Each structure stands twice: as C-alpha cells, then as structure tokens.
C-alpha cells in the first residue's frame, strides 16, 4: 500500500529497521505517506525518527505544519486501517503496530475512512 515498500525490498527495510532501533533507542522509525484516493496536500518528507514519548497529537501537529494545512482542514492518521488513539505516544503506537521490518507505517487523508 506504501510506495516505500515497493521501492525498497523487505530485506533492506528489516535490516535498516533493526539498525535504527539500535542507533536511536529513544526514538522509533515512522514512514508517513498519503492514503490512496485522498484529496489533501502533499507531504514532502516521509521518513521520521520521532521520540518514543512523543504523543500522536504532537506528531499530528508536526505533519499538519509540513503539509501547511489550514486551521479548518482535517488530517486523519491510519495505522493498519485504524485511526490511532490521539492520547497515545508514538512509542506505544510503534510497540503495538510496527511491521516485520520494524518500521511503523502511517497513512494520512482528509477523510476518516481508508
């Protein structure tokens, strides 16, 4: 579903994910791409090393600013097709939903579905 998985083989992702979790023990690797069939501004950077104690709402705000969204525009995250709890931290979100390559994948959209 993510173009990052298609352009990077799983073996390279899993190896780098293992190394990143060793080099940055207080951070978690996150890949953020626009959800398919979404109508919202583009995100420039997709690879994020965010602290394990950063909340989802703070990461929400960071991605909002990079897309340059207006105050009236919506931004929903999807982790494995589910909107994550906003009060949770990125470490909790990572420790529960990280894929086999040790990367956390988050899709964003203007709508609250898919």
């Amino acid at each position: 579903k993510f173009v990052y998985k298609e352009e990077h083989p799983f073996e390279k992702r899993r190896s780098e994910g293992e190394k990143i979790r060793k080099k940055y023990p207080d951070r978690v690797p996150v890949i953020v791409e626009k959800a398919p069939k979404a109508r919202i501004g583009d995100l420039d950077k997709k690879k994020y090393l965010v602290p394990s104690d950063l909340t989802v709402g703070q990461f929400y705000f960071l991605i909002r600013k990079r897309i340059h969204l207006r105050a009236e525009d919506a931004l929903f995250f999807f982790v494995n097709n589910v909107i994550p709890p906003t009060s949770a931290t990125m470490g909790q979100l990572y420790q529960e939903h990280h894929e086999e390559d040790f990367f956390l994948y988050i899709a964003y959209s203007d709508e609250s579905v898919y």
Binding site: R27, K45, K47, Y48, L49, P51
Partner: peptide, 12 residues
C-alpha cells in the same frame, strides 16, 4: 536534520 533521509524530531 537528516541522516540518509530520516528526519530527526525533538520534543517540543
């Protein structure tokens, strides 16, 4: 702040 394409984010 990037290392081979990874953005380093600090706590606000």
């Amino acid at each position: 702040s990037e290392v081979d394409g990874w953005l380093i984010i600090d706590l606000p």
